[PDB]
Amino acid sequence: MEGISIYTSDNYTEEMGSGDYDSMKEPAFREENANFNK
Amino acid sequence: MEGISIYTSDNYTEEMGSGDYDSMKEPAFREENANFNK
Amino acid sequence: KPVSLSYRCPCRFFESHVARANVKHLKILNTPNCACQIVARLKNNNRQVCIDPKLKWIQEYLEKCLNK
Amino acid sequence: KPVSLSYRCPCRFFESHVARANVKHLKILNTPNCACQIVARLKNNNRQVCIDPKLKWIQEYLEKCLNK
């Protein structure tokens, strides 16, 4: 697991737009609905 | 998976590279060994 | 641009229920302050949303590029 | 400019041994004729390299970002 090892990243920019589509929730991990898409 | 469909990953303009360091292998899934640096 | 040392993230806020079918790509930056930060830009030419790395579609996305 | 879209993969080659400490971030796109497309920009302009989704640290990178 070296994928957690921090690399030097700063002075870079990405502009915050807006928290819009829910914007504060987290995983249900797997399938939420078996099959009721219709 | 929920996302099997492809998106339009087009409109991308960089300076495409080629084989550099290695460029042709496969994973070991996870770990080459569970952290054997010491 | 010389990358300096400070606990900051590109996006400080995350979008959540965005459409996986409406995004073109993801861009991931793991910065010391944030778990994992993903930035996605919508199709055609629309807004850019920064996504939570734990979104279900992201759960699908990462795991599928990994193992399937 | 109009959206003249085509079905293309950004990069054609992938790097399976790039230094995780030498890269700053990952750019991930799902391509039509390519499995998973990841490209990364190194610290300063050495060159930007295209990354192998099958790369060891990429495996660990994605895997951990799923929850940590």
Curated annotation (Swiss-Prot), chains A, B:
Q: In which tissues is it expressed?
A: Expressed in numerous tissues, such as peripheral blood leukocytes, spleen, thymus, spinal cord, heart, placenta, lung, liver, skeletal muscle, kidney, pancreas, cerebellum, cerebral cortex and medulla (in microglia as well as in astrocytes), brain microvascular, coronary artery and umbilical cord endothelial cells. Isoform 1 is predominant in all tissues tested.
Indicate the impact reported for Y21A.
Reduced CXCL12 binding. Reduced coreceptor activity for HIV-1 isolates LAI and NDk
Q: Which domain of life is it from?
A: Eukaryota
What is known about its induction?
(Microbial infection) May be down-regulated by Human cytomegalovirus/HHV-5. (Microbial infection) May be down-regulated by HIV-1 tat.
Positions of glycan attachment: N11, S18
Recorded family membership: Belongs to the G-protein coupled receptor 1 family.
Name the record gives this protein: C-X-C chemokine receptor type 4
Q: Where does this protein come from, organism-wise?
A: Homo sapiens
Q: What range of the intact protein is shown? A: 1 to 38 of 352
From Swiss-Prot, chains C, D:
Q: List the disulfide bonds.
A: C9-C34, C11-C50
Binding of heparin, residues: R20, A21, N22, V23, K24, H25, L26, K27, I28, L29, N30, R41, Q48, K64
Q: What effect is documented for mutating H25L?
A: No significant effect on dimerization in neutral pH. Eliminates the pH dependence of dimerization
Quick one: effect of changing Y7A? Answer: Impaired CXCR4 activation ability, but only slightly impaired binding to the receptor
Q: What is the effect of changing K27E?
A: Impaired CXCR4 activation. Loss of integrin activation
Q: What is the effect of changing H25A?
A: Reduced dimerization in neutral pH. Eliminates the pH dependence of dimerization
Q: Where is this site: Important for integrin interaction and activation?
A: K24, K27, K43
Motif Receptor activation motif — list its residue ranges. Answer: 1-2
Give the region (Receptor and heparin binding) as residue ranges.
8-12
Outcome, altering Y7H: No significant effect on CXCR4 binding or activation
Q: What is the effect of changing K64A?
A: No effect on CXCR4 activation
Stretch list, region Receptor binding: 18-20, 27-29, 39-49
* Impact upon substituting H25N: Slightly impaired CXCR4 activation and clear resistance to inhibition by heparin
Q: Where is this site: Important for dimer formation?
A: H25
Impact when changing K1R: Abolished CXCR4 activation ability, but only slightly impaired binding to the receptor
Name assigned to this protein: SDF-1-alpha(3-67)
Provide the species name: Homo sapiens
Kindly list the organism's lineage.
Answer: Eukaryota, Metazoa, Chordata, Craniata, Vertebrata
